[PDB]
Amino acid sequence: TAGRVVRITGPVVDVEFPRGSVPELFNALHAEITFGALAKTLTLEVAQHLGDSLVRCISMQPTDGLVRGVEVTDTGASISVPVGDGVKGHVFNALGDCLDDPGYGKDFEHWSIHRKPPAFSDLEPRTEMLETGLKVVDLLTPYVRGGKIALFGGAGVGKTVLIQEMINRIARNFGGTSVFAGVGERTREGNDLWVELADANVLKDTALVFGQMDEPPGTRMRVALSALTMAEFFRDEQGQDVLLFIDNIFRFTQAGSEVSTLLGRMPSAVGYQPTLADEMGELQERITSTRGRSITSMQAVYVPADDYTDPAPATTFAHLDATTELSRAVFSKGIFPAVDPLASSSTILDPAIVGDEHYRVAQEVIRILQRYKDLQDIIAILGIDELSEEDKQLVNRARRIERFLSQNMMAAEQFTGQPGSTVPLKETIEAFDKLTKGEFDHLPEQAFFLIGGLDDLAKKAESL
Amino acid sequence: XXXXXXXXXXXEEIGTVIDAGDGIAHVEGLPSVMTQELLEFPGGVLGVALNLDEHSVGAVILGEFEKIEEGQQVK
Amino acid sequence: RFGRVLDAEPRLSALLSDYTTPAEGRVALLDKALVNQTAAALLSQ
Ligand SMILES: Nc1ncnc2c1ncn2[C@@H]1O[C@H](COP(=O)(O)OP(=O)(O)O)[C@@H](O)[C@H]1O
Ligand SMILES: [Mg+2]
């Protein structure tokens, strides 16, 4: 005995079941579409109970071709993804289907994507700094080994460049095992990544799960859970340390809104779903470094219309330990990676963790840039000349500090042709201390763009 | 015994427009219509069956929706 | 007894839902499938 479809509205499908055989929430159901070249087996996920033995489900595939009255069979379990050391090296989708080898993973151990987060008693905060080799990050927003990092920004400001750069900075040398969740990003980038990780030979040590934009919202929101399951398996069972890249996690909340509008739930503010914070929290709290093991996560967050006050970014800000924030304005200045020094933040930027020499320089730089950002309102009208000398001396080196935060990243080599640069922390501290104290105030601003370290600064200045 | 009784009890479709407004229509009948099926109306007008409810089908009208009216046959 | 049957048999119970279908055929099927003459008379009523 099994159920029947009785309503269809986009990817959302209502199914009626016998009186006593209603499926539990988040159970997976199978249905058939038999029109033609469009035919396929649909997986539906139970999202609600509507009463009278009727339940409302989210389709993981496009419903096109689904006719009313077709039978629907309950699997009795949630959507299950393959887990195991054999997962590494291959590409998967949200439903556990391998794309590189269709039959792969059918015989592996299967874990449910829906799981409760770790007990509070097993949580412990991390403080060990992670050295990436980017000046602005390592100085003002030091990442945490085993913490949660995020890259915010609008459209067309450097999510992908900086994300693959950080892949080169961490994953290229990380001794552990990596997972890459592509949540609603463009597919061409996924193919580029699948090729690049093989060129660099890193592929054999990382797993990829993709849910790109073309897919309907129902799976577009579950892809994150699908990959997080493999990440937390590598965490809890194998005991390895893990890197969990996710791009872009805003599309998870966007798919949540799309499915919400169909489920019939009333809209919140500007038009997101209610429980937005609850879904995002249920997702993010699972990505945590429990005692004795670690899962380092770098997330990308989209920001529509550059409205940093949009409820979704404003919500996701709460779950992150490090938050690099890109900006349109800094990008227009030609600065790259275009990080906003005053908006970005990191919780471990305190003297007890990073040391006094680092903290003092970071805070002096922040003070200089803040005074600059306050004088901008006059700078824009009357130019620098109107300012008093205590302000003009400050602005002259503020511009230089700002431009020196730029760096010639390895990823940009494919566009600019200039090779990449990695700098150690101590050299960055020395350089910015010298800058704030004025040992380089005599050089022109254009000398500072996209340098790298200090020796490269001298080499470039000599040529001008 | 129950199965045979159920089978004994169980032992070209055309619908009708019940509601029409501003480029959208609702259609009765068509139990076997597929979602996003290209329906056709008497006036030489097509439609896309977006929503399939328990009692009626929601169809966005393509082209001249002026030619649609209540009581028209849809196939 | 009839209630016990109709509760234990969920598919038969769903088939017994007939206010949308033609009531004459529903009555015919129920009578053919389903004794105390008065109880079955009330059931058909
Ligand atoms: N240091 C740099 N120099 C020159 N161009 C850059 C640099 N960093 C990023 N870019 C440009 O910015 C673009 C980033 O786009 P992307 O981050 O994918 O936007 P989104 O993620 O919003 O689609 C790239 O196409 C790249 O050409
Ligand atoms: Mg990108």
Q: Which of A68, A262, A263 to mutate to test the interface with B (most CBs of B within 10 A)?
A: A68
- The alpha carbon of residue B31 is apart from the nearest alpha carbon of chain C, in Å, by 14
- The alpha carbon of residue B5 is apart from the nearest alpha carbon of chain C, in Å, by 6
A369 close to A342: Cβ distance less than 8 angstroms: yes
A17 sits in the region (left: phi over 0; alpha: psi -120 to 50; else beta) called beta
Q: How far apart are CA C40 and CA A197, in angstroms?
A: 74
- Which atom belonging to ligand 1 lies closest to the Cα atom of A159? 17
- What is the b/e burial string over A213-235, where b = at least 16 CB atoms within 10 angstroms of the residue's CB? eebbbbbbbbbbbbbbbbbbbbb
Residue type, A404: F
Q: Is the peptide bond between A337 and the residue preceding it cis, with omega within 30 degrees of 0?
A: yes
Structure tokens at A247: 């791009």
**Does C11 sit within 8 Å of B5, measured CB to CB?**
no
Tell me the chain B residues in contact with residue C32 when contact means C-beta distances shorter than 8 Å: 5, 8
Ligand 1 binding pocket mutation candidate from A135, A249, A326, A415 (most atoms within 8 A of CB): A415
Question: Which structural technique was applied?
Answer: cryo-EM
Judged by a CB distance cut-off of 8 A, whether residue B8 touches chain C is: yes
Catalytic residues of A: 159, 185-186
- Which atom belonging to ligand 1 lies closest to the Cα atom of A338? 8
User: Among A322, A335, A315, A324, which residue's Cα sits nearest to residue A409?
Assistant: A335
Distance A163 CA to ligand 1 centre (A): 10
Structure tokens at A305: 């219309």
Distance A206 CA to ligand 2 centre (A): 20
- Which atom belonging to ligand 1 lies closest to the Cα atom of A186? 23
3-state secondary structure labels for all residues of chain A = CCEEEEEEECCEEEEECCCCCCCCCCEEEEEEECCCCCCEEEEEEEEEEEECCEEEEEECCCCCCCECCCEEEEEEEECEEEECHHHCCCEECCCCCECCCCCCCCCCEEEECCCCCCCHHHECCCCCEECCCCHHHHHHCCEECCCEEEEEECCCCCHHHHHHHHHHHHHCCCCCEEEEEECCCCHHHHHHHHHHHHHCCCHHHEEEEECCCCCCHHHHHHHHHHHHHHHHHHHHCCCCCEEEEEECCHHHHHHHHHHHHHHCCCCCCCCCCCCHHHHHHHHHCCCCCECCCCEEEEEEEECHHHCCCCHHHHHHHHHCCEEEEECHHHHHCCCCCCECCCCCEECCCCHHHHCHHHHHHHHHHHHHHHHHHHHHHHHHHHCHHHCCHHHHHHHHHHHHHHHHCCCCCCCCHHHHCCCCCCCCHHHHHHHHHHHHHCCCCCCCHHHHCCCCCHHHHHHHHHHC
Is the C-beta atom of A156 inside 6 A of ligand 1?
yes
Q: Whose CA is nearest to atom 19 of ligand 1?
A: A156
Cα(first)–Cα(last) distance of chain A, in Å?
81
Q: How far apart are CA A274 and CA C24, in angstroms?
A: 47
Please state the length of chain B.
Answer: 75
Ligand 1 binding pocket mutation candidate from A137, A160, A248, A450 (most atoms within 8 A of CB): A160
A91 close to A99: Cβ distance less than 8 angstroms: yes
Is the C-beta atom of A412 inside 6 A of ligand 1?
yes
3-state secondary structure labels for all residues of A401-412 = HHHHCCCCCCCC
Distance A337 CA to ligand 1 centre (A): 8
Judged by a CB distance cut-off of 8 A, whether residue B4 touches chain C is: no
CA of residue A93 relative to chain centroid, distance: 18
Structure tokens at A64: 């096109």
Structure tokens at A344: 């970005």
| Nearest-by-Cβ selection for B2 from C12, C25, C26 | C12
Longest Cα separation, chain A:
85
For the stretch A417-426, contacts whose Cβ atoms lie closer than 8 Å and that sit 24 or more positions apart, written own/partner, are: A418/A450, A420/A168, A421/A451, A421/A452, A421/A453, A421/A456, A422/A133, A422/A169, A423/A133, A423/A135, A423/A138, A423/A452, A423/A453, A424/A131, A424/A133, A425/A131, A425/A138, A425/A358
Q: How far apart are CA A337 and CA A362, in angstroms?
A: 18
- With contact defined as 3+ CB pairs under 8 Å, the chains touching A are B, C
**Does C32 sit within 8 Å of B8, measured CB to CB?**
yes
Please state the length of chain A.
Answer: 464
A341 close to A327: Cβ distance less than 8 angstroms: no
Q: How far apart are CA A361 and CA A384, in angstroms?
A: 25
Kindly tell me the sign of the dihedral angle through the C-alpha atoms of A384, A390, A394, A396.
positive
Distance A415 CA to ligand 1 centre (A): 9
CA of residue A165 relative to chain centroid, distance: 13
B56-62 and B45-52: which strand pairing? antiparallel
Q: What is chain A's Cα-based Rg?
A: 25
What is the DSSP-derived secondary structure letter of residue B39? E
**Does A6 sit within 8 Å of B54, measured CB to CB?**
yes
Q: How far apart are CA A89 and CA A30, in angstroms?
A: 29
Is the C-beta atom of A160 inside 6 A of ligand 1?
yes
Q: Which of A4, A19, A21 to mutate to test the interface with C (most CBs of C within 10 A)?
A: A19
CB pairs under 8 A between A and C: 11
User: Nominal resolution in Å?
Assistant: 3.4
Distance A186 CA to ligand 2 centre (A): 8
Q: How far apart are CA C31 and CA C45, in angstroms?
A: 11
CA–CA distance from A300 to each of A326, A364, B19 (Å)?
A: 11, 29, 46
- The alpha carbon of residue C29 is apart from the nearest alpha carbon of chain B, in Å, by 6
User: Among A93, A67, A328, A57, which residue's Cα sits nearest to residue A222?
Assistant: A93
Tell me the chain B residues in contact with residue C16 when contact means C-beta distances shorter than 8 Å: none
User: Among A422, A432, A424, which residue's Cα sits nearest to residue A357?
Assistant: A432
- The alpha carbon of residue A13 is apart from the nearest alpha carbon of chain C, in Å, by 20
